[model samples]
Target: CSNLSTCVLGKLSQELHKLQTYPRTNTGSGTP
Candidate 1:
C-alpha cells in the first residue's frame, strides 16, 4: 500500500486486488 497516494484510493484497491491482497482503507489524520 506504500504506493497508494492521494486521489488514488481506487487505483490502489484495483492494484491490490490484482495481487490477491486485501485493500485497506485509512482514515488518516487530517494533518501529518
Candidate 2:
C-alpha cells in the first residue's frame, strides 16, 4: 500500500506541475 500511494502521489505532482507551467491568456479583459 505504501508503494502504491507513493506512485500515485508522484503522478499527481507531475500533472500539477505541468498545469502550473502551462501558458494562460487574460479572459476577463480585452487587452493583451
Candidate 3:
C-alpha cells in the first residue's frame, strides 16, 4: 500500500505542476 500511495502522490504532483504556470497565480490563462 505504501508503494501505491507514493505512485498516486507522484502522479498528482506531476499533474498539478503541469496545470500550474506560477503555482501561486496565473495571468496569461495558459497551462504550463
- Among the numbered candidates, top lDDT falls to 3
* TM-score between model 2 and native: 0.58
Off by over 4 Å in 1: 1-7, 21-32
lDDT of each: 0.47, 0.61, 0.66
| Candidate 3 structure quality by residue, lDDT tens digits, 1-32 | 45988999977886676568556554455344
What tens-digit string does per-residue lDDT give for candidate 1 at 1-32?
45547449867665655555323332332112
If ranked by TM-score, best first, what sequence of candidates would result?
2, 3, 1
For each of the candidates, give the backbone clash count. 0, 0, 0
4, model 2: CA deviation in Å? 0.5
Q: What's model 3's TM-score?
A: 0.52
Q: Candidates' TM-scores?
A: 0.40, 0.58, 0.52
Query: Candidate 3 has which clashing residue pairs, if any?
Result: none
Model 2 clash pairs? none
Error of 1 at 7 (Å): 4.4
Using TM-score as the measure, the top candidate is 2
Select the stronger candidate by lDDT from 2 and 3: 3
